[PDB]
Structure 1
């Protein structure tokens, strides 16, 4: 089997991407944030504290003839951005782009943090990291991909995120028309539960490539590119007037600037992030100070190849017995 679904930016900045997901019988379609940095499929629901729902579409398990309470199971998750959610668990039928999993754990939120409430466009998350990170207790549950894997034509999914435009998540096949050149594959460590890999270096604009190993995670659920402070300083030094602002929470730059590109290495291959992908717009409405899309990972504890990086590539998440990651230009 295979599946193919379009993923759509939630706003004009590509702050996140939503993908429609069918849950239950009859189907209830929710728009979920596919997150290769976590491993829980959780949704706003009829159980979510009413004051914490503000415009989201909810899953109502009592209206699904295939929903079953997973007795005694609870979940609770905290994300790197400080947000969180928790609740109980159903199993139900879940379909993405024509690919169906029966008995998928659907984590129903009883509580969500303010950031989730305040974002009316995201109805929940669909985790695509390794199932070892799943938070369900006392019996850990499998991700949608893990459940689908054996049925897929090939044990892979691909992320093809757009810049200020829709893109595609495919399951079970590689669309050879979706990228240019070849796909370069690189080793993955699953030791921390992430799609963790090592970039071979970087360049800023038309500058020379610096060969240096940068361990980080391919994370579709993180907006920005978070890299070591040395790398980030080298980038922003090429933008007149750019500075790190403790008050704002990162590097800012004059909105009148033209940003240089940023290249990262995948083995001997190179992925170029155009400068415009690095612009996250005014820090507040009407400001002429703009927020940068490349930020320091110092104090995160890990480097994160988030959407800024991934949307410059066609990315293969290869879930073979020994997982790997592939990157192609597009």
Structure 2
């Protein structure tokens, strides 16, 4: 089997991407944030505290003839941005772009934190990291991809995110028209539960390539590119007027500035992020200062190849017995 679904930016700056997901019988369609850096599929629901719902579409398990409460199971998750959610667990039928999994664990939120409430465009998360990170207790549950994998034509999914435009998540096949050149594959460590890999280095603009190992995670759920402070300082030093602002929480730059590209290495191959992918718009409404899309990972504990990096590539998440990651230009 295969599936193919379009993913759409939530706003004009690509602050996140949402993908429609059919849950239950009859289908209830929710727009979920596909997140290769976490492993829970959770949704706003009829069980979510009423004051914490503000415009999201909810899943109502009592209206799904295929839903079954998973006895004794609860979940509770805390994310890198300080947000959180928690609740109980149903199994139900879940379809993405024509690919159907029966008995998928659907984590129904009883509580969500303020950031989730305040974002009316995201109805929940669909985690695509490794199932070892799933938070369901006392019996850990599998991701949508893990449940689907054996049925897929090939045990892979691909992310093809657009810059200020929709893109595509495919399951079970590689669309050879979606990229140029070849796909270069690179080793993955699953020891932290992430699609963790080692980039071979970077270049800024037209500068020469610096060979240096950068360990980080391929994360569709993170908006920006978070890298070591040395790398980030070298990038912003090439942007006239850019500065790190402790009040804003990162590097900012004059909104009209010409941003250089940023290149990262995948083995001997190179992925070039165009400069305008690095522009996240005014720091506050009406400001002449803009927020940068490459920021220091100091304090995170891990480097994150988020959407700023991934949207410059066609990315293969290869779930073979020994997982690997593939990157192609496009």
Please give the secondary structure, in 2, of the residue aligned with 1:231. Answer: helix
Number of residue equivalences:
330
CA distance in 1, matches of 2:288, 2:208: 31
1:226 CA drift (Å): 0.1
Give CA-to-partner distance per residue, 1:199-232, whole Å, 9 cap, x none.
Answer: 0000000000000000000000000000000000
CA distance in 2, matches of 1:82, 1:309: 23
Give CA-to-partner distance per residue, 1:29-59, whole Å, 9 cap, x none.
Answer: 0000000000000000000000000000000
CA distance in 1, matches of 2:90, 2:273: 40
CA distance in 2, matches of 1:309, 1:114: 28
Please give the secondary structure, in 2, of the residue aligned with 1:93. Answer: strand
Please give the secondary structure, in 1, of the residue aligned with 2:106. Answer: strand
Q: TM-score, normalised by structure 1?
A: 1.00
CA distance in 2, matches of 1:185, 1:124: 31
CA distance in 2, matches of 1:305, 1:79: 16
Structure 1: unaligned runs, 5 residues or longer: none
Give CA-to-partner distance per residue, 1:75-124, whole Å, 9 cap, x none.
Answer: 00011011100000000000000000000000000000000000000000
> Could you tell me which residue of structure 2 aligns to residue 216 of structure 1?
216
CA distance in 1, matches of 2:215, 2:159: 20
Runs of 4 or more consecutive aligned structure 1 residues displaced over 3 Å after TM superposition: none
Give CA-to-partner distance per residue, 1:144-173, whole Å, 9 cap, x none.
Answer: 000000000000000000000000000000
CA distance in 2, matches of 1:259, 1:326: 27
CA distance in 2, matches of 1:64, 1:219: 31
Structure 2: unaligned runs, 5 residues or longer: none
Give CA-to-partner distance per residue, 1:59-83, whole Å, 9 cap, x none.
Answer: 0000000000001100000110111
1:310 CA drift (Å): 0.1
> Could you tell me which residue of structure 2 aligns to residue 105 of structure 1?
105
Give CA-to-partner distance per residue, 1:163-194, whole Å, 9 cap, x none.
Answer: 00000000000000000000000000000000
CA distance in 2, matches of 1:308, 1:267: 19
Please give the secondary structure, in 2, of the residue aligned with 1:31. Answer: strand
1:28 CA drift (Å): 0.2
- Cα RMSD (Å) of the superposition? 0.3
1:195 CA drift (Å): 0.0
1:256 CA drift (Å): 1.6
> Could you tell me which residue of structure 2 aligns to residue 275 of structure 1?
275
